[PDB]
């Protein structure tokens, strides 16, 4: 029944409209849904705009008049210039009239602000089309009609605000470069008249609604107007006094003054300097007397959230930080300005205590600006001693967990600066906070952690003798604090914090060996503590200390008979007996860091052998009984044992890289045999159970083995220094073990890690194995492409790794693509373009890079038959496929790299780098230049793809584009101009001369 408005042969029944609209806005459930589909189909009728005047006149429903204006908006912005000039004048007239009649009925003006704002914006769309060339009197007549009515003057302020926004704030994406400049110039020409009106209203007006809308528009003007309108009038005085007193105007005025603090200002006129000081002085004065004194508890006020207090305190933070970052030097040398300077910073101290993460980040960035300046600028830091002293306490008390990573690093930076500025104050604050943990007055899990992080963050700022006294005092107090408590939970927290601080002071650990030893031995004791988190803490602290202090584990210390690494390896089974496998691997990885500090080859390899003794024996056993009867590999326990052995090798190899080679050779050949046996079992299970077998624990366990073997090989090869051995010992067994298995498994059983592993092989040694790269392509290219070329969705990992592999092959061993049969080289081209069309950034970016790199490979071949055949076969495929993703609105994330590729393609022809004609002997006169043919191909291509463009538009665009194919920034502007023009009818072809 509701579907009747969709019949346009009959008149539009307004009453049926208002019922559909109401059922959508106030209705619910199925009725609401139905009305929605109707309203969308109605609004999307390309004729609905004709019935807009009916609705605006004879509807009583503001939602329906709003939809009417949306239908008009679509028409003005997309099809305006196609209309008979009659309709254009008509539409304009009954939008102007509808607005006047709404402003005159004080009742409608009061209650229909949403419909009035929509009408204003619709008017502003017309201005973007018609003004000032076809409407030169708009501004004068607007200024004239303002004095005849407060409601009309107020609404004119809203029209100008939206106009300023559309011209200066939001034009970059929505208009051509030429059209934007024209409107900016036009507004600039008549601004003197607009400012006059705006300043009179402000100085005389008493209607707060009129005032607020004038200040709202002023906020927009300050983005672009010249400073003289601000500094050569009284308006700073008004903003910083009169309008800071009223809470109505206060929020908008403050945002205006924030922008004023950013105006382009000559930094050498003394009077302007005094004006910048003065309006800051006034503003702080109004806040102290009308809002709150500098002593007020802003933390409590923000938490109470009365009225707009939270927004106001945010805006004050933004004002103070913006102004002071730019102008605080103005206040630092005059003694009469010292109180103002420090009161402004004291407000910031109070703002910095508010519990509000994002606001804290805003003030924290300012503090960084300040303490960095006090660290370098002569004679400044004494000014701020008392501000900085308070800041130390604020930052220490609001320290966040390290490893919210970004906020901790910012807090650490500010606190390190503040420690350099006064070490003594920092040390005293931290010890004092520590006593109130011991004396229980501020003791809490949160509070003791916060303080340990703060103590840990300043490592490196004290002298080593002060640090030594400081660290000692901190640990001593902490130890006593742990004893003081009972119950695992409490004692767990303090003991962790103790280890955190220790881990942060490696300079101290390096100089106190006996202490370092005791630390480590305690971490070991904690690797048997089953309390939740202790063991993870012990292991993370152990490796963290090792990364920093490794040299002290590898030399023989005085009073020790052996390097301590040997003592760790001897007891490693005991030490790790109660750890979970992840934690064991971290432990072995930490040991590998130490072992790589030993530069004597024989001793390094012996340490390596001893460290791997347990996994190597479990390995030998398993290889012995695994080969006996391949039944075991069905034993989930043996599969878990195998994967954990491999993971241990990955961990140690991650630490040792090139040094890991001897251990790799101990397992390499049997590990690849194991890869094959596991492969057969996976295949055998998928045959006996179907594809669902890949989801079962047993098969997932077997695939884990294969994946960790590939990760191990990848990890070693990406770090190897001896590439002769990589090529002549590692690569051939590896390719024989993995390539055929991948090609001949069903898609759901192929591991994408095989692709990632091959990408690394090509990366590091691709140049040395051209036959191996060919073998790789043969085995993975076509069968992987067929997995991923049916949709953009399936096999997401294979997709990504596929194009990482093609990318590296195209860089390092481009010969492999030359050897492809012509049929398969054509699939390679198809595959590149396929990548263009992904929204998945991982895929899309590599697809554009491969295309770019391929063109360069082809270019470097010179005038030879393969290059000539490539341009004949694929040049225009690349030009048109690139143009497609450039213009279809669904690949905006790749604009830049689409542009680059397009610019390279076009430049080849305008530099005569293509030796054969790109056309058929037939289709063009003999002797035609590729330049001429390219311009014809593109004109025809765009004419059929964008039939609503004129021949002249297309020709001016292509002339500009080809002319600018050496200037990427300009080329890109011309492309963006084109993307605007295809969205509408009637685009000015002269826009494309903007660069010229």
């Amino acid at each position: 029944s509701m579907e009747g408005i969709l019949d346009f042969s009959n008149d539009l029944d307004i009453a049926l409209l208002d019922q559909v609209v109401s059922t959508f806005y106030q209705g619910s459930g199925v009725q609401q849904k139905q009305a929605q589909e109707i309203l969308t189909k109605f609004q999307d009728n390309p004729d609905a705009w004709q019935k807009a005047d009916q609705i605006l006149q004879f509807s009583t429903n503001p939602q329906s008049k709003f939809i009417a204006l949306s239908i008009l908006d679509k028409l003005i912005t997309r099809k305006w210039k196609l209309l008979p000039n009659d309709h254009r004048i008509g539409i304009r007239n009954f939008v102007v009239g509808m607005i006047i009649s709404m402003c005159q009925d004080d009742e409608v003006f009061k209650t229909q602000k949403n419909l009035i704002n929509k009408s204003d914006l619709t008017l502003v769309q017309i201005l973007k089309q018609e003004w000032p060339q076809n409407w030169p009197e708009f501004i004068p007549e607007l200024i004239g009609s303002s004095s005849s009515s407060v409601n009309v003057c107020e609404n004119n302020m809203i029209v100008l605000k939206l106009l300023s926004e559309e011209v200066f704030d939001f034009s970059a994406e929505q208009m051509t470069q030429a059209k934007a400049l024209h409107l900016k110039n036009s507004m600039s020409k008549e601004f003197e008249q607009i400012f006059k009106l705006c300043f009179q209203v402000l100085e005389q007006g008493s209607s707060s609604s009129l005032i607020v809308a004038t200040l709202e528009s002023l906020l927009r003007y300050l983005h672009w107007i010249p400073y003289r309108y601000i500094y050569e009038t009284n308006i700073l005085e008004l903003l910083s006094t009169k309008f800071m007193t009223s809470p109505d105007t206060r929020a908008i005025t403050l945002k205006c003054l924030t922008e004023v603090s950013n105006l382009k200002i000559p930094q050498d006129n003394d009077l302007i300097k005094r004006q910048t000081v003065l309006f800051f002085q006034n503003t702080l004065q109004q806040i102290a007397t009308s809002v709150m004194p500098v002593t007020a508890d802003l933390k409590a006020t923000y938490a109470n959230a009365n009225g707009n207090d939270q927004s106001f305190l945010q805006d004050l933070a933004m004002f103070l930080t913006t102004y002071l970052a730019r102008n605080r030097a103005l206040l630092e040398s005059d003694e009469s300005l010292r109180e103002l300077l420090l009161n402004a910073h004291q407000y910031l101290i109070q703002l910095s205590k508010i519990e509000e993460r994002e606001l804290f980040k805003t003030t924290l960035d300012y503090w960084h600006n300040l303490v960095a300046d006090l660290f370098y600028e002569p004679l400044k830091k004494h000014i701020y001693e008392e501000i900085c002293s308070q800041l130390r306490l604020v930052i220490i008390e609001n320290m966040v967990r390290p490893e919210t990573i970004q906020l901790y690093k910012s807090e650490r930076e500010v606190l390190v600066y503040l420690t350099h500025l006064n070490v003594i104050d920092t040390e005293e604050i931290m010890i004092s906070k520590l006593a109130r943990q011991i004396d229980g007055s501020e003791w809490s899990w949160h509070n003791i952690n916060t303080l340990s992080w703060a103590i840990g963050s300043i490592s490196g700022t004290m002298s080593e003798d002060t640090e030594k006294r400081f660290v000692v005092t901190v640990i001593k107090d902490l130890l006593g604090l742990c004893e003081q408590k009972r119950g695992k939970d409490n004692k767990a927290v303090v003991a962790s914090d103790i280890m955190y601080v220790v881990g942060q002071y490696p300079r101290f650990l390096k100089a106190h060996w006996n202490f370092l030893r005791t630390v480590i031995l305690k971490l070991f004791e904690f690797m048997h503590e089953t309390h939740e988190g202790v063991q993870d803490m012990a292991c993370d602290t152990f490796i963290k200390i090792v990364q920093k202090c490794k040299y002290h584990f590898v030399i023989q210390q005085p009073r020790e008979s052996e390097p301590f690494i040997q003592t760790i390896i001897r007891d490693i089974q005991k030490t790790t007996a109660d750890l979970q496998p992840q934690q064991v691997h971290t432990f072995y990885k930490a040991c590998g860091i130490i072992i790589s500090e030993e530069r004597s080859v024989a001793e390094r390899n012996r340490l390596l052998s001893d460290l791997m003794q347990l996994p190597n024996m479990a390995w030998d056993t398993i290889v012995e009984q695994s080969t006996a009867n391949p039944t075991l590999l069905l034993d989930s326990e043996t599969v878990k044992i195998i994967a954990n052995i491999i993971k241990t090798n990955v961990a140690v190899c991650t630490s040792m890289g090139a040094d890991f080679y001897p251990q790799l050779g101990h397992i390499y050949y049997n590990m690849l045999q194991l890869y094959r046996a596991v492969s057969s079992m996976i295949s055998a299970q998928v045959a006996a159970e179907g594809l669902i077998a890949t989801k079962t624990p047993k098969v997932r366990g077997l695939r884990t083995i294969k994946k960790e073997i590939l990760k191990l090989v990848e990890t070693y090869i990406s770090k190897a220094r001896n590439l002769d051995d990589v090529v002549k010992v590692l690569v051939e067994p590896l390719l024989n073990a993995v390539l055929e298995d991948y090609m001949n498994n069903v898609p759901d059983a192929r591991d994408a890690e095989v692709l990632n592993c091959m990408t690394t092989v090509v990366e590091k040694v691709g140049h040395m194995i051209p036959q191996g790269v060919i073998l790789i392509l043969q085995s993975v290219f076509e069968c992987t492409l067929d997995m991923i070329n049916k949709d953009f969705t399936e096999y997401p990992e294979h997709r990504v790794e596929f194009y990482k592999l093609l990318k590296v092959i195209n860089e390092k061993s481009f010969a492999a693509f030359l050897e492809l049969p012509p049929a398969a080289f054509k699939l390679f081209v198809d595959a590149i373009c396929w990548a263009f069309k992904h929204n998945n950034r991982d895929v899309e970016v590599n697809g554009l890079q491969i295309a770019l790199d391929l063109v360069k490979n082809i270019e470097r071949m010179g005038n030879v038959p393969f290059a000539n055949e490539f341009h004949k076969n694929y040049f225009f495929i690349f030009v048109s496929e690139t143009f497609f993703v450039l213009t279809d609105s669904d690949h905006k994330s790749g604009f830049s790299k689409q542009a680059l590729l397009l610019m390279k393609l076009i430049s080849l022809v305008y530099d005569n780098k293509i030796s054969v004609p790109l056309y058929q002997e037939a289709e063009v006169p003999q002797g035609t230049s590729n330049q001429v043919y390219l311009s014809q191909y593109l004109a025809n291509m765009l004419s059929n793809a964008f039939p609503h463009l004129t021949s002249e538009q297309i020709a001016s665009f292509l002339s500009a584009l080809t002319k600018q194919c050496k200037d990427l920034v300009v080329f890109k502007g011309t492309l963006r101009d084109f993307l605007v023009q295809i969205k509408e009818v009637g685009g000015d072809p002269t826009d494309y001369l903007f660069a010229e």
Binding site: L479, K491, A492, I498
Partner: peptide, 10 residues
């Protein structure tokens, strides 16, 4: 800080 050796969680 040889009192570290007696650090216990209990």
């Amino acid at each position: 800080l040889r009192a570290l050796e007696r650090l216990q969680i209990d």
